[PDB]
Ligand binder design. Structure first.
Ligand code: SF4
Ligand code: SF4
Ligand code: FCO
Ligand code: CL
Ligand code: FE2
Ligand code: NI
Ligand code: H2S
Lengths: 483, 283
């Protein structure tokens, strides 16, 4: 038996943004963890006093990996506050803009952020140096396939951004989503261009990405047995499928303590005892949220607030959405689960709670979700009407409020805006990596990733690779978490 | 380039950035990002993409920095916040000591061959420095000057920049250095910067004076809805008249669109972005 070693990792790399992780290891396992989001900008105060329409540009600069998610949440909040009635064709165009970035983001995450956890890259920076015992288990052939696919994926993710820009203007930071809809009507010619790129992405997802995740996973079966944490998840709904506001590609729900529950957003509160914000702002629902930095506050260790749902610490992201919604698994996944794992599965929950809520389960969920998004995008390409108007032009209200709910690639996202005297009076953001990468709440309950680190194996304190491997499975984006 | 060619070391530090300046670079078409990384530069430290992590990654950068003192290129993405003794941006920890962005730029800044301030945040302060902020977000050139650090700075702004502006400025510089050595080469680069530190090949021309809708502007034919692509976008908020960038020609994301065709220009390359370009959706 061994005693304690305390390990600090700052920066955690191959994530987005500024994260320190500190873990306590005892006898070869993590027994405690603290996550610190280390960079603050304060978008919620920067936004005050502006024309509300500016928000759908300003907020994207929270995160250049997921700006379409912030764009979407912002325009939905503005739509509600302004009483803007988005035309049907604009709803579909928005889904095509944003859906293309799901493809970009998941591919970026698996290959360009995560795959080096399992694959040795070429012998030059930024692929070396690395831990001397990095636990890289793949055969020469499979490792080379990983490298070849990493390189091909650089082109595929770029093509995904061309898809975003076709109707979104450019990417990062789209111009094409505004209050009232989408700024550019899809033409027949540009829909051909979107479909041609989409075919290439589909082929890569179906033939390379989904198979490689299961194949690498089959060499790391131990990684399905760790990282469970609270086994608790949130989905707030995303990608509206009609104009009612009641039907979405991902439907909302909460899952905790083995039970499905409805999602009621009034049960969200943000705690700050362990966050660098003024103590008197603790425990606020986002409609009354406040952002008062306190970088010298004793005992705090993060610029991420601690969101809790009816007191629960929940995770978000592809696993959360796929668990809550329980879609059928991809044909590839069903086959490889049988061939490589001896698992007979039809729907996502057939993986079982333990394997789904695991380090490798989160990578599998993200690959399955990417495949699932292909079908949604294909459907929108059949549903869109070339030439039909996509925007209305609503007057700015003097006094109003609105909330936009969506699912960023990393998990649940909401923006709340209150308008007074035709200007932003308050703007509050509750983002995906906020739900995942937050610190303890005022009762000392850990954030989702902090809790999922408990039990992670560290058999070699000099090469503690599984700490950041677990973190990377959640695809963190600390710039989103802090804003 | 070749896999066996000369490739200078680059460290990429993120301050108050959004990672969009890294992402835009990943979208480079020619050369592709794979070719940039394997044939043009040696990206020795970059938190988003590098293999190693934590104190080991920091120490690797420090070892390279010592070996290449005066010769590495330092890319900064994001502004540098000076309030609260630098605490609003911590970029790492080594020797049980946290390293703020302030600390990092004071450490590596003096020893770089040049600092490339990539994006409007790094170049000019940008959104983190805008009204309502409270972190003391500071542009790279101002921070270095305030601290007596004389290393040359080149600004490559945009929110985000186009990948071609980033790669193209690197290529400009490396060509000048091949022809003239480091100091002579950087002097040739400085000669082609405008008064805002921007390379004139990319930022020397005005959007509006080169815009395909200029005839409509001059005729007073203005679109009243974003989806009317015939009229000029001025009344919808286009800031093309006050913006120096080549987007009208280069366009974005493989040439598939650009901001003025799709919606409006928001002036994202300009030193007063965002506040001097706001409100975005009226003139
Ligand atoms: S205002 Fe904008 S759309 Fe109109 S001519 Fe100038 S740059 Fe072009
Ligand atoms: S058109 Fe204007 S807003 Fe768009 S990238 Fe160019 S300078 Fe920035
Ligand atoms: N995806 C994404 Fe960004 C994060 N975390 C948001 O919301
Ligand atoms: Cl997104
Ligand atoms: Fe927030
Ligand atoms: Ni993000
Ligand atoms: S992100």
């Amino acid at each position: 038996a061994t005693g304690r070693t305390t390990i600090a990792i700052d920066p955690v790399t191959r994530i987005e943004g500024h994260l320190k992780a500190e873990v306590v290891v005892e006898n070869g396992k993590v027994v405690d963890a603290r996550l610190s989001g280390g960079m603050y900008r304060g978008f919620e105060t920067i936004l005050r006093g502006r024309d509300p329409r500016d928000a759908s540009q300003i907020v994207q600069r929270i995160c250049g990996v997921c700006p379409t998610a912030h764009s979407t949440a912002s325009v939905l909040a503005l739509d509600e506050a302004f009483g803007a009635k988005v035309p049907n064709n604009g709803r579909i165009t928005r889904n095509l803009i944003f859906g293309a970035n799901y493809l970009q983001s998941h591919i970026l995450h698996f290959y360009h952020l995560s795959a080096q956890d399992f694959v040795q890259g070429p012998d030059t920076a930024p692929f070396v140096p690395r831990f001397p015992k990095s636990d890289l288990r793949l055969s020469k052939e499979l490792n080379k396939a990983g490298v070849d696919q990493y390189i091909e994926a650089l082109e595929v993710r770029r093509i995904c951004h061309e898809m975003v820009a076709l109707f979104g203007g450019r990417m990062p930071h789209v111009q094409g989503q505004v209050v009232g809809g989408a700024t550019e009507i899809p033409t027949k010619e540009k829909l051909v261009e979107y479909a041609a790129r989409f075919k290439k992405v589909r082929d890569f997802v179906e033939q390379k990405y989904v198979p490689v995740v299961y194949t690498i996973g089959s060499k790391y079966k131990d990684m399905f047995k760790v990282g469970q944490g609270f086994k608790a998840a949130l989905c707030v709904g995303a990608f509206p499928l009609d104009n009612s506001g009641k039907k979405h590609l991902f439907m909302p729900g909460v899952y905790a303590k083995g039970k499905d529950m409805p999602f009621d957003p009034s049960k969200i509160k943000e705690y700050v005892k362990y966050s660098w914000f003024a103590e008197e702002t603790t425990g606020l629902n986002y409609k009354e949220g406040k952002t008062i930095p306190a970088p010298d506050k004793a005992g705090a260790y993060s610029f991420v607030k601690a969101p809790r749902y009816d007191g629960l610490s929940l995770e978000v992201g592809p696993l959360a959405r796929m668990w809550v919604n329980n879609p059928e698994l991809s044909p590839v996944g069903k086959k490889l689960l049988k061939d490589l794992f001896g698992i007979s599965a039809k729907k996502f929950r057939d993986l079982g709670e333990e394997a789904a809520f695991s380090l490798m389960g989160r990578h599998v969920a993200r690959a399955e979700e990417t495949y699932y998004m292909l079908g949604a995008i294909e459907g929108w390409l059949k549903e869109i009407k070339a030439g039909e108007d996509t925007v209305v032009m609503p007057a700015v209200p003097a006094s109003a409020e609105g909330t936009g709910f969506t699912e960023a690639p990393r998990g649940s996202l909401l923006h709340y805006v209150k308008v007074k005297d035709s200007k932003i009076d308050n703007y509050q953001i509750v983002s995906a990596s906020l739900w995942n990468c937050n610190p303890r709440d005022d009762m000392g309950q850990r954030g989702a990733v902090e809790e999922a680190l408990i039990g992670i194996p560290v058999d070699d304190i000099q090469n503690p690779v599984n700490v950041a491997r677990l973190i990377r499975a959640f695809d963190p984006x600390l710039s989103c978490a802090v804003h | 380039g070749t896999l066996t060619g000369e490739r200078p070391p680059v460290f990429w530090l993120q301050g108050q950035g959004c990672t969009g300046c890294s992402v835009t670079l990943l979208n480079s078409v020619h050369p592709s990002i794979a070719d940039v990384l394997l044939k043009v530069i040696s990206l020795e430290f970059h938190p988003t993409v590098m293999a190693w992590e934590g104190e080991h990654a920091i120490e690797h950068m420090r070892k390279v920095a010592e070996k290449f003192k005066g010769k590495f290129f330092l890319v900064i993405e994001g502004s540098v916040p000076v309030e609260a003794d630098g605490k609003y941006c911590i970029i790492g920890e080594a020797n049980h000591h946290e390293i703020s962005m302030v600390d990092a730029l004071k450490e590596f800044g003096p020893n770089a061959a040049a600092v490339l301030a990539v994006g409007t945040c790094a170049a000019y302060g940008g959104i983190p420095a805008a009204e309502g902020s409270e972190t003391g977000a500071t542009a790279v050139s101002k921070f270095l000057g305030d601290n007596g650090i004389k290393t040359p700075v080149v600004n490559i702004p945009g929110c985000p920049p186009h990948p071609d502006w980033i790669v193209g400025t690197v290529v400009l510089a490396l060509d000048a250095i091949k022809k003239n050595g480091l100091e002579g080469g950087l002097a040739e680069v400085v000669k082609v910067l405008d008064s805002d530190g921007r390379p004139t090949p990319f930022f020397g021309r005005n959007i509006h004076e080169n815009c395909p809708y200029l005839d409509k502007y001059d005729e007073g034919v203005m679109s009243a809805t974003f989806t009317d692509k015939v009229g000029c976008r001025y009344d919808l908020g286009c800031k093309g008249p006050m913006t120096m960038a080549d987007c009208f020609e280069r366009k974005w994301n493989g040439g598939v669109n650009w901001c003025v065709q799709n919606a409006v220009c928001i002036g994202c390359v300009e030193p007063d972005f965002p506040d001097g370009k706001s409100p975005f959706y009226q003139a």
